[PDB]
Amino acid sequence: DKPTVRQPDAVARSHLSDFGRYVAECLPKYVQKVQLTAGDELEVLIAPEGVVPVLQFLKDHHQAQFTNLVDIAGVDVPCRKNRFEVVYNLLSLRYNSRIRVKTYTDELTPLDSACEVHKAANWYEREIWDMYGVFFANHPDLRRILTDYGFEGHPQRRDFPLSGYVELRYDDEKKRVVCEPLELAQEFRKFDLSAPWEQFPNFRNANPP
Amino acid sequence: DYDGSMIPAEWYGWMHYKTDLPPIRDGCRPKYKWIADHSENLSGTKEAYYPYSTTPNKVEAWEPKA
Amino acid sequence: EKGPLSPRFRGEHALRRYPSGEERCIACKLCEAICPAQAITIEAEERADGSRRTTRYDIDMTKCIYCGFCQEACPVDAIVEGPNFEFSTETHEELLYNKEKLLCNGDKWESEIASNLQADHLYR
Amino acid sequence: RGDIEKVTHTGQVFDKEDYRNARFVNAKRYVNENWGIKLIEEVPPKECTERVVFCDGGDGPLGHPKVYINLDKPGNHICGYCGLRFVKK
Amino acid sequence: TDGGPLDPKTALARPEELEQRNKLSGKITVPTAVNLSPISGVPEEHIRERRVRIHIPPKNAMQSGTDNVNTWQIEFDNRERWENPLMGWASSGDPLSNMNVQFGSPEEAITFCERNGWRWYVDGAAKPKKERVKNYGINFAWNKRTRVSTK
Amino acid sequence: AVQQVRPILSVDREEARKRALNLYKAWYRQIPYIVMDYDIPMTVEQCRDKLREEFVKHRNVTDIRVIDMLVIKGQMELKESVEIWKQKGHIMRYWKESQDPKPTDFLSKFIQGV
Amino acid sequence: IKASTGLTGLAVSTNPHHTLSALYGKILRAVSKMPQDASYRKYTEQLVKQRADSVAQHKDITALEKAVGCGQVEELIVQAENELILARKMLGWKPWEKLVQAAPAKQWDWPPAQIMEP
Amino acid sequence: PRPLKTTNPAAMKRGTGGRSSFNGIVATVFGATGFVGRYVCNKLGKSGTQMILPYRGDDSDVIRLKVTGDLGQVLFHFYNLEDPASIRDAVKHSNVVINLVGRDFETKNFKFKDVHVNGAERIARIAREAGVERFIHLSSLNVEANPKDLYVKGGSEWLKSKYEGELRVRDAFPNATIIRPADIYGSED
Amino acid sequence: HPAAHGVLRLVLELDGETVMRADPHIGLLHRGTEKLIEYKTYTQALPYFDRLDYVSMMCNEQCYSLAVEKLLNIDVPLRAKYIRTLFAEITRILNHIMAVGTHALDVGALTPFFWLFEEREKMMEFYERVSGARMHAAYIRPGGVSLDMPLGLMDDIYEFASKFAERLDEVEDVLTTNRIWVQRTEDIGIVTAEEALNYGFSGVMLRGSGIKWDLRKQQPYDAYNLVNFDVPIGTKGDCYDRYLCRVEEMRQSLRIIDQCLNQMPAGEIKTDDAKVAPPSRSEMKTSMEALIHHFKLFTQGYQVPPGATYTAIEAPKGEFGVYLISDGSSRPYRCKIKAPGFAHLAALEKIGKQHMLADVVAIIGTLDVVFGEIDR
Amino acid sequence: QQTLPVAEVAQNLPKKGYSPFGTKQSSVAEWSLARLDDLLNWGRKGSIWPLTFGLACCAVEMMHIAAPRYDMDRYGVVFRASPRQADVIIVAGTLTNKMAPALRKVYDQMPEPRWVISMGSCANGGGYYHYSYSVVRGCDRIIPVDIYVPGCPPTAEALMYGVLQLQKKVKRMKTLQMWYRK
Amino acid sequence: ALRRDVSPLIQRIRAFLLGREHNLALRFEDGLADRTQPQPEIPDGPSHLLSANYYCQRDGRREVLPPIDLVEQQKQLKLPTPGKVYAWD
Ligand SMILES: NC(=O)C1=CN([C@@H]2O[C@H](COP(=O)(O)OP(=O)(O)OC[C@H]3O[C@@H](n4cnc5c(N)ncnc54)[C@H](OP(=O)(O)O)[C@@H]3O)[C@@H](O)[C@H]2O)C=CC1
Ligand code: SF4
Ligand code: SF4
Ligand code: SF4
Ligand SMILES: [Zn+2]
């Protein structure tokens, strides 16, 4: 009746809802919460210790068969006490479905590596350590994968300046490139893109304490 | 010394197939009095460009002499 | 022989002006705010005759990406990406356009830009 | 050369002692000659009869947004966008 | 458990390695007041000189909306800028000057600042606005001065 | 104000102290190789001081977990230097040679400007 | 006999009926050790019976695959080899217990960093 | 209290000292292409100086110095040492002039008379006319009024010219600084 | 090294010519793309995705565009779908030509590079004719594409397609049945099916080894519902069949264009909502609401409701996904981008183990890795 | 800006001549060097060998310059791999910090006379990633640049126009004629 | 006549070599569509109607609700599978 609004896929929504509960019974020790996102995508919020167990369960159980691990995204949120969240995007070819597993960790506390369950996470975990600074215990060989050698800090934390602290230049005295404290000809011009009027009332009262 | 940049804007569209109509065969071309004659790209030359701030300085310093 | 291109081609920039001769740009600064590369810097001041106008308009062509968002956002078609794509220089400094350089292009290329806009504005 | 001491329409120029003129010893300083402040001043105002008129820059969708002007006051009235002047007599 | 073979790694591991495999499961205690300045990678010079101001962003007087002041923030000191010699842009060698982070309460903001070694100082939280009557009928009052001469 | 946490590598400060010393061993062993295999001005005695100078930076560190992380990162560089993945430029980056001294006295800073 | 599995590096299985029967038999023994009220024990125990009987019920692998769906017999074995690993591994984790780590406050709150008024 | 030559704020010291800073110094390094010049120019570029680098030969030799500084802080100016009109153009805006012009041997167009004494004088004399505040010159350490040869019958000409060039420099630009190095080394030497 | 594509740094451990260990040192093209996106409005961040997977230009936009639409909870008009799907296939045909063209150079053959890059030049006239740029069109946008196709384009799209079969046959004659070509590819870099699933493989790497998987068929997201086409599958999981899959994909994609060109309807290009998509310029000059929305959509951009989503597409390289998070502001909170080649290069440690350089060079091409994907 | 001569005014101007030094040399020795200087420039001008750097998505448009549509090879431009035989380097892409020491070395290994071309915004001034924490803000920070080709990516013709600018820059070198004055 | 192609004899020779009749890759002005075309009249949208078009119905942004908690929304209110089985084999 209204073309602009996207049509929800109820059949896919129905299966994910019930199977979402199913996981909650099988893994009470670890599954803190299960929620169906507005995009009709399932999210499974687990405790930090339940990473390897839960991932194993989804990959090996007949009903889950989430054989394919697609991503490991890291999210930094300084507000929260355990500022770093880690999200696994799994795909199940046999059942043609996607599920998300989220977990939270602090700056220091290690996060059990999942190379075992899905050893596609060999580099994804390396990236997460490099970008955010989340350490992964039992990893084969944790090591920076993206940033420069000897780059100090972890750039993708929200508490890291956009331009970094040090630039590079060539110094003909030393016959090599040298690092100096940053000095920009034109600053990054912020823009205050903040709306003074709330637009989405549905989320005003959301998340009661 | 032929350059790709010697083509005046009148014929430029016709030369890059933007139009099938040469400047003679179209009357939609304007003839404003502030249009300028074509010019090469002048680099490595005494006639080249060089940027400069286009704003006069904002803060005036107090003059002791008066 | 060269080309072919299309009237939508994005190239070097140029500040147009009205047929009267007055500059189109009114220093609304939409182009600055949308420029993904932050390649635009504008400083505006109440002109002597009292019209909203720019005392500064700089594009850092070594920072622009020729996306074309500036010409879509301009409410008066002041800034356009002209047909020119042959403006390589021999010095980095010569690639930083200030308003006088941009205005000169808008006069050198005026005939062709006005023809592209006419043949293309309806789509846009 | 001449261009160094020329003063642009925005009103800026390097002082004859300012070192920044050094950048122009091997290049030129294009100062645009078609000053918009004078070309618009040249065009005469448009006499009208109605109390309010509109200017759209002259070419509809290729002009500026349509704005309406009120001509009750005596003085000829400038358009915000294009700078054209209107007057009722 | 069940018959199925035992893991060679744990089955053959010496008792010492199993022991340290246990206490590395651990759950040891550590004090909660920590400083992560050594590992955060900030240059030492910044950590010593630059203060951090916990504050609520100021409401825009030219608007009535408020949902853009529903957070606490951190902004660093306003170090020097200078005119750019070539084109006249604004220039600065102040990476942290660009910075901004959001928080839910000053306690979290202080907690975050302590964990990174920054020196901080909090602007006084705006006291909740006192109740205002704002009655309409008083605009038309018999003997009071609140009567409006306009409309 | 104490909390329960998961250890990083060690369980006791003494074990942490033990790990840190090993990192000093491996570096101190490695300096003679780094001088040979990198075209850099610095000599073994100068470098062996730089190792001492910087292990001193983290003089007041107390938390074992922080000491673990310093040793994780400290070890990572050594592997990247035991290998020559780090290039000539990166090794000399430990000296900040390009940056010239900034005077600390008030009168000099004032005259020099902020 | 299938000429080829159609998948690189997956070999046709000889006596898939036996290999499946052993694996399902093993799983039910590993699952048996789990506490009765564990929901995982109730589901796999229910499930593996539905797979196990079909393996014995049908003697033609093509008919077996239709009767069970869920891929070729070779994959059916590949699946079965997993829940041994899961069921065996999970006798050590004891997931059926209560929540190991109570969630922190605001740890799953979105959007973040908003003042909450008591 | 030394008077401030110009109070125009744009020509004052600004910034932290990095490449985007400004020393308020507008130098002119004659002979920047040489061995010493590569190191003088780079050290200036660190501070934020604006430098003009006159070059007599083809641009290819001097183009490598453009990396030393920042945008718009390095400018080249072709010049002929004999023609004063060329030199005035490169010294009419400078606060400092540095004269690293010299040779270890004679040429077909430039004898030690033309380079060390007549040339260096011309750069100094023109500088005083323009109004350069500072001036710097180089000379040998063993420089002497009449140096005696030691093994070559005509091996002392280079020092003789250097001494004479030193005096004419002090003659034309009386407050000129003179730095007398001895056996400089360190690469491309 | 020419075969490395100027980014890769393989620190090989050579026991003669055979490789015992390969260390793909990555990050020579890390440009912190995903941190810049956190500072840019959604529209300002669209060009960033043209740069990721820079050979599949309009396919990356589609992934980003679909992500924002799910959060915005809007639908695109019927016509815009066909334009999108049409240009997804044209991009796919472009990309496979680069893969086949580049892969041939690594082996040593030269002519297929030039015989195909002549057609590639014609194809990027259509990019230039609709978007105005031969590369990085920035054409697909969350509300649908940004402009209608020029009048008379579709005739020239047909004209190119009608002749493209012959061009692909001539390269096929010189390459497919060539005895030397088979030896340089056959049984080099075998990927067993069960290995691939565990690795996060996708795309032709997944279908090279016999797995029947294609997101266009399983999780359709555009006019792919309204078209019918086959999917190429390989049984041996080596370079050679994977090569054949790429060529066959270019045949089938040429089939989809045959249906797009005929089924294209007439209608609006953007979604109607002027609060998500800019309004027409003519309407901007006339109506007050259009001007306000134009003003706000460009300065402040549009507000996306809080939430997270993961959309993926069948990009030519593989599965390209974008895990986008929105915090209710005008800017994304975080934008993680799956690179299909990331998984592929992680597996190079073993696939090419116990092989020599001529084989490893071949494997690198068949992994089909456009860097910039791998380096965000 | 200096505008081009009008036809009637240009109708009188003498034919330009090939050499940019003219045939106005006073002496025989100077004139021979001038002509001999052209011979060098004609040589180096004719065969300019890029290095096949190809860093980022300018690199693709650096292939289409070698494609049949534009055919760099028509101008004597031949791609080469080793920096020893390569004469010109076309830095096309975003030179990140991790790369920066590698470009410097590769440039150094190139034998003189070596000219550098900067392709696209990335290599010109940092381009779209100018403010990133791991991007060298323009390759001119690292190596001298001789021609800047703007664009993102530059069109194939745009780069071709850039290459011809490098030929003209080569054509007017005064390597010999300035030795005489030296 | 209209196409600049090689002589008839070579065309036969070339045709023999390719093993198939050849269609010339090069585009000619006659085959393509003219570069100056009439101007378009792009249609409107479904919601350009003048009535019964309130944004409060058409809008989609304000209809998205927070994530739903699966476990609780039962309490307040064949084994399950993530979706429908597929034969990836
Ligand atoms: N061991 C040492 O270097 C010592 C230093 N000095 C003096 O320091 C000064 C610089 O040192 P250094 O770098 O080693 O000298 P170099 O020979 O290495 O370079 C000298 C510079 O001066 C230029 N030059 C030479 N003659 C002329 C001329 N007629 N006209 C214009 N320019 C000319 C050269 O330009 P180009 O090369 O382009 O032709 C070159 O750039 C020298 O004058 C030297 O006498 C004194 C004693 C010891
Ligand atoms: S084209 Fe895009 S990047 Fe370039 S100036 Fe315009 S808006 Fe900015
Ligand atoms: S958008 Fe147009 S009118 Fe506004 S400041 Fe930019 S050029 Fe001027
Ligand atoms: S300048 Fe543009 S086209 Fe070139 S590499 Fe950078 S983003 Fe890609
Ligand atoms: Zn008007």
From Swiss-Prot, chain A:
| A GO BP entry | reactive oxygen species metabolic process
GO MF term set = NADH dehydrogenase (ubiquinone) activity
Which EC number(s) are documented for this chain? 7.1.1.2
Q: Which top EC class is given?
A: translocase
Q: Which GO terms describe its cellular component?
A: mitochondrial inner membrane; mitochondrion; respiratory chain complex I
Q: How does it assemble?
A: Part of the mitochondrial membrane respiratory chain NADH dehydrogenase (Complex I). Interacts with sicily; interaction is stronger with unprocessed sicily protein.
Q: What does this protein do?
A: Core subunit of the mitochondrial membrane respiratory chain NADH dehydrogenase (Complex I) that is believed to belong to the minimal assembly required for catalysis. Complex I functions in the transfer of electrons from NADH to the respiratory chain. The immediate electron acceptor for the enzyme is believed to be ubiquinone.
Name this polypeptide is given: NADH dehydrogenase [ubiquinone] iron-sulfur protein 3, mitochondrial
Whose protein is this, by species?
Drosophila melanogaster (Fruit fly)
Q: Which gene encodes it?
A: ND-30
From Swiss-Prot, chain C:
Q: Which cofactors? A: [4Fe-4S] cluster
GO terms for cellular component:
mitochondrial inner membrane; mitochondrion; respiratory chain complex I
GO BP terms: namely:
mitochondrial ATP synthesis coupled electron transport; mitochondrial electron transport, NADH to ubiquinone; mitochondrial respiratory chain complex I assembly
Which amino acids does the record list as binding [4Fe-4S] cluster 2? Answer: C64, C67, C70, C74
Q: What is the lineage of its organism?
A: Eukaryota, Metazoa, Ecdysozoa, Arthropoda, Hexapoda
Q: What is this protein called?
A: NADH dehydrogenase (ubiquinone) 23 kDa subunit
**Gene behind this chain?**
ND-23
> Record-annotated residues binding [4Fe-4S] cluster 1?
C25, C28, C31, C35
Query: Example GO molecular function term?
Result: 4 iron, 4 sulfur cluster binding
Assembly information from the UniProt record: Part of the mitochondrial membrane respiratory chain NADH dehydrogenase (Complex I). This is a component of the iron-sulfur (IP) fragment of the enzyme.
Catalysed reactions listed for this entry: a ubiquinone + NADH + 5 H(+)(in) = a ubiquinol + NAD(+) + 4 H(+)(out)
Q: Which residues form the 4Fe-4S ferredoxin-type domain?
A: 16-45, 55-84
Q: Superkingdom of the source? A: Eukaryota
Instruction: Give the disulfide map.
Output: none
Q: What happens when the gene is disrupted?
A: RNAi-mediated knockdown is lethal. RNAi-mediated knockdown in the muscles impairs biogenesis of the mitochondrial membrane respiratory chain NADH dehydrogenase (Complex I). RNAi-mediated knockdown in neurons impairs neuronal ATP production, reduces locomotor activity and shortens lifespan. In addition, results in large vacuoles in the retina, ommatidia disorganization and selective axonal alterations in mushroom bodies.
Q: How is the cofactor bound?
A: Binds 2 [4Fe-4S] cluster.
What task does this protein carry out? Core subunit of the mitochondrial membrane respiratory chain NADH dehydrogenase (Complex I) that is believed to belong to the minimal assembly required for catalysis. Complex I functions in the transfer of electrons from NADH to the respiratory chain. The immediate electron acceptor for the enzyme is believed to be ubiquinone.
Family listed: Belongs to the complex I 23 kDa subunit family.
Any idea which UniProt keywords this protein has? 4Fe-4S, Electron transport, Iron, Iron-sulfur, Metal-binding, Mitochondrion, Oxidoreductase, Transit peptide, Translocase, Transport, Ubiquinone
Q: Where in the cell is it found?
A: Mitochondrion
Q: What is its EC number?
A: 7.1.1.2
UniProtKB/Swiss-Prot annotation, chain E:
Q: Does the keyword Electron transport apply?
A: yes
Q: Topology in the membrane?
A: Peripheral membrane protein
Q: Which GO terms describe its biological process?
A: mitochondrial electron transport, NADH to ubiquinone
Instruction: Name the keywords, alphabetized.
Output: Electron transport, Membrane, Mitochondrion, Mitochondrion inner membrane, Phosphoprotein, Respiratory chain, Transit peptide, Transport, Ubiquinone
Q: What happens when the gene is disrupted?
A: RNAi-mediated knockdown results in mitochondrial membrane respiratory chain NADH dehydrogenase (Complex I) deficiency. Mitochondria in the flight muscle shows a wide range of structural abnormalities including dispersed cristae, onion-like swirling membranes, swollen mitochondria, sparse matrix and irregular cristae densities. Eclosion rate is reduced, locomotion and feeding are severely impaired and lifespan shortened. In the brain, there is a pericerebral fat body deficit.
List Phosphoserine occurrences by residue. S149
Localization annotation: Mitochondrion inner membrane
GO CC annotations, alphabetized = mitochondrial inner membrane; respiratory chain complex I
Q: Which domain of life is it from?
A: Eukaryota
The record's comment on protein family reads: Belongs to the complex I NDUFS4 subunit family.
Q: What does this protein do?
A: Accessory subunit of the mitochondrial membrane respiratory chain NADH dehydrogenase (Complex I), that is believed not to be involved in catalysis. Complex I functions in the transfer of electrons from NADH to the respiratory chain. The immediate electron acceptor for the enzyme is believed to be ubiquinone.
From the Swiss-Prot or TrEMBL record, give the protein name: NADH dehydrogenase [ubiquinone] iron-sulfur protein 4, mitochondrial
What is the native source organism of this protein?
Drosophila melanogaster
Q: Name the encoding gene, please.
A: ND-18
